[PDB]
Amino acid sequence: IDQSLKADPSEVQYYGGYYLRKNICKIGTNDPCDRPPYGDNDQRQRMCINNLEKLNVDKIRDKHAFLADVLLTARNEGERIVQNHPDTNSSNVCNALERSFADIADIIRGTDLWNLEQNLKQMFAKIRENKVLQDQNYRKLREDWWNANRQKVWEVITCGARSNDLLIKRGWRTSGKEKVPTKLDYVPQFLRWLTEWIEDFYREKQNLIDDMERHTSYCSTCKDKCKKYCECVKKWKSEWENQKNNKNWIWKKSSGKEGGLQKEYANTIGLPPRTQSLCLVVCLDEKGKKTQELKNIRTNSELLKEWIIAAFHEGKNLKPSHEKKNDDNGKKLCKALEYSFADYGDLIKGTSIWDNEYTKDLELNLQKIFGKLFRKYDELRESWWNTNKKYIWLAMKHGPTIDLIPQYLRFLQEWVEHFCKQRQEKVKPVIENCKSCECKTECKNKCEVYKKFIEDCKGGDGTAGSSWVKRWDQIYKRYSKYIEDAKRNRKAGTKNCGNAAENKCVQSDIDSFFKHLIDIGLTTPSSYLSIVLDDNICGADKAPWTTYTTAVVVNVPSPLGNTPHGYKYACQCKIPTNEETCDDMNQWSNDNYELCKYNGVDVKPTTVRSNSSKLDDKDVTFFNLFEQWNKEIQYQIEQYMTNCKEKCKCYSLWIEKINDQWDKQKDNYNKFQRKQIYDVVSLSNFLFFSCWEEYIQKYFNGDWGSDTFEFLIKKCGNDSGDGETIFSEKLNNAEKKCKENESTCIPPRTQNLCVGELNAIQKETELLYEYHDKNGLPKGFCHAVQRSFIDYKNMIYIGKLQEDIKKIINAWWKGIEGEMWDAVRCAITKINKKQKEWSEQFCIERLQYEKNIRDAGDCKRKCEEYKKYISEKKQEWDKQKTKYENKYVFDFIFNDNIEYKTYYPYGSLCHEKGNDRTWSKKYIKEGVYVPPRRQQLCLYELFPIIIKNKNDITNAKKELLETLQIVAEREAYYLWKQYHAHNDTTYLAHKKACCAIRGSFYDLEDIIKGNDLVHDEYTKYIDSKLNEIFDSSNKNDIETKRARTDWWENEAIRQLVWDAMQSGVRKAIDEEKEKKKPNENFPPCMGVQHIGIAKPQFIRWLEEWTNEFCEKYTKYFEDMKSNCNIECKKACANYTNWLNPKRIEWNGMSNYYNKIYRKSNKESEDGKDYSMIMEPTVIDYLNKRCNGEINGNYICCSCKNIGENSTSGTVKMKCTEVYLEHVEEQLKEIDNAIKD
C-alpha cells in the first residue's frame, strides 16, 4: 500500500522531533553533508551526497530517519546551489534545483549511472523488514518509495530559495503564452545529464559572448577554446550514448488571470483598487502600433524612460476630473501618489506581496533586463531603485517620499485608511444627529446603522467577504509571524553607520525593518497603525487603536467596534449608571436556592446518585458553589484591601455586590442546614474549618504551637465557631478601606534612656542628637528617636522602672504620647534655635567591612575578623528573623548549610529541590503566579561575585560568566536528581526533567535579559547591580537592557550556560551508579544545543501551571476513584483543597491573559512583548498546546481534558458526605483536642 512507503521525519522523536513539522525548511548518520559552485567541473555528477556516503545503517529508526537523512542531503545541496549558481535568471536556478532533485531520485532508486549503493541497498533491505515484498536489490521497492515521498523532498529542496522564484513552488509561473511542478526525474538520467550539460555550456557561451563583445587582441581565443571542447564532447553522441470597473479589495490568492495576493500572503492583506489599477510597463498602450512598447530595451535610459512615463500616466489616472472643487483634494492625492510610488518601487525592486495577470511576467522581464544591463557586477535592483527613484517620483507628482517600508505595512495602512474613511462617514451621524447626554428614537437607529456597518458579515464595502474583525485577525497573524521571523534571525542588526528610522545606518531589509520595529516597541499592527495614522481620521470620537473593545465575545480594537468609543452606553441612551461604568471585579450572581453561579459554570446535575444522608442534587451543587465562592471572595477581599474617586466609587459598588451576595449565601446555607439536619455544621463551623485547613494545606500539606497557634486564633474563630463574624469583620474592613483612603536581642541604646528620675523625655532627644551629630540632620537621626518613641510608649535590669511606674498607676497614656510628640517637636525647635534597626546597623557595618577588605597585604587578618564577626552575629540573627517572619507568617550571609562553610566563607551551595513549594504571587514587577521551579533557582554564588566587583567591570564580563556556568550546572544536576526520582526507571521522568531544566535555563536567561518578572531578593539585587555593570549613566532602556541582551546573545554565553546545564545532567547520569541504573548515555532531549527562542515568562508559567494542574488532577482523580472510610476522605479533601487555589490562579492568570493577549510593549502594562500570543481566551490558547505528548523540547504539558478547565474548576456526589464527615472530624479535633 502507498501509505506504507510515505514517511514523515517529524514522527521520529529524536535522532542520534517536533521541529520537522511545518519547519522542515531548516533541518542516525551523524556525519554532516559537506562537499560546490555550478558548472565548475566543466574542465554534472559531483554533488552533496556525503551524508549518505557514510550511512551507518545500524543506528536507524525505520524509514523515517532515512527520509530525514535524504531531506538533509537535499536541503544542504539546495541551499548550496541557490547561492552558487550564477545566472541572474531564477528560471535557471529553478532548473538546477529540479535537476538536483532528479539526481536524488536517481541516487535513491539505484539508477545512478556512475560505498553509496551498498548502504542504500542495506537500508532498503531493512525497510523491507518493516507489506513484506508486495511493492534485484529491491529496485521496485526503491521506485515505489520514491514515488511515495517524491513531493516531500521537492518542497524541502526548494525551501530556502528566494521568495521570488520562476518555476519553483516559491513562484511557479504557468507560462501559458500542491504538487511537484516539474515531473522531470522520470526522464532517463542520461538525457537529464545531456540537457544539464548543454544548458551549462550554452549559458557559458552566452557569458563568453557578453564578456567578449563582438563589437584589441584574442578576439576569438575563447571562441576557439569553446569550439574545441564542443568537438571534444562528441562522446555524448557516438561514444557514451552507445555505451548504454471600480475595483474592490481582493484579499484572495492569485487564481491565474485574476488579480489578488501571492501565496504565503493570500488572505493576509487586501489589494487597494489603486494598487490593482496601477499603470505598468506592459499595460502601457501608447500608440495603435505596439512596436514602441514592444521589441526590447537596450540600456538603463530606456528602462528609466518606461518607468517615468508609466509613473506619469499613473499620476494622471490618480487625480479626480474636477477634484470636487479642490477643497477636499489636497493631502489625499499626495498620499495616494506616495503609495503608488512605493508600489512602483517594491515591484521594480522585486519584493512585492501582491500578484496580478501582468505582475509575474514583468517581474521576470525586469530580472532579465537587470541581468543583461548590469552584467559586470538582487542588490543591483534595489540599488538601481534607490538611485533612480527620484526621477519617477517627480514624474508622478506632475500628474522624494520616504517609502523604505515593507509592502505588507503599506497595504495595511491603506486598507485601514479606507476602513476609517467609511467609519468616519458612518460615525458622523451619531456624533451630531445623536448625542450622549431624539432621546431614544434617533440615537437608536443612528447607532444601529453603525452596528450594521461594523458587524457586517460581508465586510461592508472594504474587505471582500469576511467581517472587518475576521480580516483584522489575518492582519495580526501575519504581523506577528513577521515579528517572530525578525526575532529568530541574528544577521539583521543595524549596519555600521561609521531610534529614528535611518536608511542604511538602521539596517535595510524587511527583517531589518521589523527588528527596528521590535526595538522601538511596535510588535503589533495596532500600535504600528497608532503611529503611522494621522490624528482624527476615524471620527470626532477619540477611539485609539491600542485600546480594545468587546454568544461569542470578540475582543477587537476600538475602531472595529459595534459602537463609538464612549457612545457604547448612549447607543440606546441607557442610564449612565455607575454599575455599567464599574464594569471597566466579582464573577458570581422559600424552598429555593438563590444560587450565585460563576459566569459560565451553572448548576451541575449530579448523575452518580446513591444512598444519601438527605443530600439532594441541588444541595450538593449549592455546597460546591458555596465552597468555591467563599474560597474566592475571602481571598479577593484581602487582595483588594491593598481618578481615585472613580476607583473608590467602583470599589464601594464592589463591596455592595459582595455584601448582597453574602446575604444570598447566608440564607442559602441556612436552607441547606435545615434540609440536612431536620431529617451537619453551619456557616459558623464551615468558614472556621475553611480557614483552619489553610494552615493545614500550605505548611502541613495533608493532615497530622506558640507563635502560630495564637496566629490561628487571631486569624479565624477566636477559640470557637464564629464563621459569621470571621467574614463580616473583613467585609467591614474592606468596606471602610477606600473611604478612609479618600478621607486622607536588644539594641544597646535600649540600655540607657531618660529614666534618671528612677524635660521628661526631652533630654534624651538632645543627647541622641549630640551622639548622632559627632537638611540640618545627620544620616538616620529620625530613626533613632523613632525607636526611642517606640521603647518609651511600650514602657508606659529595666524591670524595676516599669514595675514602679505601674505601681504609680490607657487613654491617659495616649494623651501623654500626644503631648510628648508635641514636646519633642518643641525640643527640635529649641535645638534648631542654638544651631529593623539591627538590620540597618549590620548592613552599614558590613559596608564598612567591605570597604576595609577592598582597601587591601595582611588581607587574611581583616577577612578572618570579618568571618568571626559574621559567626558572632549569627547567634543574634538566629533569634531575629523568626520573630519577624514566624510571628507574622538576606539569606546568603547566614546560610547554615555545611557546604557553605566548606566552599564559601565570604558572607556550589545548591541542594535537593524540596517539592513542598506552591504557586504564589510575590516579588513580581500584576496577577501572575511564580512557579516553584523559578522560586528554587540557584543564585547563591552570583551574590559574592557581584559584591566583589564593586567599582570593578573588568571581571563583570569574566568572573560572572564563570559563576553563571557553575550555577547552571548545579541547577541542572539538582533538577535531574529530583525529576528522575519523581518516576524512578521511567522514560517520562527524564522528559519532564528536560522540560524543567529548559524552563530554568529560560528563567536564568531572562534574569539577564530585559526585566525578570520576579524580583526575588536574590535576583532583585542581582539586576540592581548588573544594570549598573553595563551602564554609563545615560539611559535605562538602550544603554542597559539592549547592552545586556547583546552580552547574553553575542559574546564569547547562552550556549555556555546551556552547555553547563548539559554538563550538570551528565554528572547526574554518571552519579546514577548508586541508582544501579543504566548510565549508557544522556537522554537526547538535552542533545540539542540550540533549543530555540524564549516565549514570555507569563506564557511559560502558564504552560508549567497547566502541566502541573493536569498531572496532579490525574493523580488525585485516580486516587479518589480508586478509593471511591478514611481512605477516600483524604483523597476527596485533597482534590478540593488543591482545586480551589488552582481555580483562583486560573482566574487571575486568565484575567492577565485577557489584558495581554495581543498587546505589546507600547500597550501592555509591562515593557514585555506578547505579540506572539494570538488566542482570545487562555482555554483556547492551551487547547492547541497542552493536548499532545510531551517531547521535552517544545511541548511542556499534556492533559486528558482540555476544553473544560473552567468547568473542571467548579465541577462526585458522595465526596460531599465524606467531606462533611472530614469537616466534623477536624472540628472535633481543632475545637476540643487543641483548645487551651
Residue numbers in the entry: 23 to 38, 43 to 53, 61 to 68, 71 to 78, 101 to 171, 177 to 192, 194 to 198, 204 to 245, ...
Question: What do the study authors state?
Answer:
Intriguingly, a highly basic pocket formed by DBL2X, DBL1X, NTS, and DBL4ɛ has been identified to accommodate a dodecasaccharide with six sulfated disaccharide repeats from CSA, which fitted well into the density map. Moreover, 16 residues were identified to be responsible for the direct interaction with 10/12 monosaccharides, except for the 6th and 11th units of CSA dodecasaccharide. Among them, there are nine, four, and three residues derived from DBL2X, DBL4ɛ, and NTS, respectively. Owing to its high resolution and potential high stability in the core center, DBL4ɛ was used as an immobilized reference for the structural alignment between the VAR2CSA-CSA and VAR2CSA ectodomain. Interestingly, a significant conformational change in the core region was observed. Firstly, the DBL1X moves closer to DBL4ɛ at more than 3.2 Å (ranging from 3.2 Å to 4.4 Å) for multi-helixes to facilitate NTS interaction with CSA and close the pocket. Secondly, there was a 1.8 Å outward bend for the key CSA binding helix of DBL2X in the deep pocket. Lastly, the rest of DBL2X moved about 2 Å inward to shrink the pocket.
VAR2CSA encoded by a subfamily of var genes from Plasmodium falciparum (P. falciparum) named as var2csa, plays a vital role in the cytoadherence of infected erythrocytes to the placenta. In line with the previously proposed model, our structures showed that the core region is well-defined and covers NTS, DBL1X, DBL2X, ID2a, ID2b, DBL3X, ID3, and DBL4ε.
